[PDB]
Amino acid sequence: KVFGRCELAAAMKRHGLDNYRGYSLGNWVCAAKFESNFNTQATNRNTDGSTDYGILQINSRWWCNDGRTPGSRNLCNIPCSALLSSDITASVNCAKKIVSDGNGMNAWVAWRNRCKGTDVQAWIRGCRL
């Protein structure tokens, strides 16, 4: 599923991401925009053999199991394929664990590079919330 901007903002809010760990909703939408382009089926293979999955590009080295990342963890206790679903519940729950890990949203390098310090509220402007 390719989400609309305001549709994703609304689903992210309902799953409780708005101001999670102090990160306003626009931060999460911006991150999803640049990680996945709002596509829940997005995948990216990394040089270390791991793979990023889903609307928030959660990485198999630590957070999910895909059976092909040797010496990896599954801290969110899910199959990585659950992160590709049209329903973002697993992605949101796993993002809550990632962002609580000590480095906040810098865990998403696309967020640090492309969202941090910008006008992230613009990503939810004009949305019915």
Ligand X SMILES: CC(=O)N[C@@H]1[C@@H](O)[C@H](O)[C@@H](CO)O[C@@H]1O
Residue ranges in contact with Na ion by CB under 5 A: 60, 65, 69, 72, 74
- Residue 103, C-beta contacts closer than 8 angstroms, at least 6 positions apart: none
Marked catalytic residue, from 48, 52, 87, 119: 52
Rounded to whole angstroms, how far apart are CA atoms 16 and 93? Answer: 9
* 101 is known to lie in a ligand binding site: yes
Marked catalytic residue, from 35, 48, 66, 87: 35
Instruction: Residue 26: count other Cβ atoms within 10 Å of its Cβ.
Output: 20
The CB-of-19 to Cl ion minimum distance in angstroms stands at 9
Using Cβ positions, the residue closest to ligand X within the complex turns out to be: 59
Which span (10-18, 56-64, 73-81, 121-129) binds ligand X, by CB under 6 A?
56-64
**7 is known as an active-site residue:** no
Residues forming beta bridges with residue 55, ordered by sequence position: none
- Helix (H) or strand (E) holding 44, with range, is strand 43-45
Residues forming beta bridges with residue 59, ordered by sequence position: 52
Task: Tell me the Cα Rg of the chain.
Answer: 14
Tell me whether residue 14 or residue 45 sits nearer to ligand X (CB atom). 45
* # binding residues, ligand X (CB under 6 A): 12
Q: Does 60 help bind ligand X (rule: CB under 6 A)? A: no
Q: Does 57 help bind ligand X (rule: CB under 6 A)? A: yes
- Residue 98, C-beta contacts closer than 8 angstroms, at least 6 positions apart: 58, 63, 107, 108
Active site residues: 35, 52
Residues that bind ligand X (CB under 6 A): 35, 44, 46, 52, 57-59, 98, 107-110
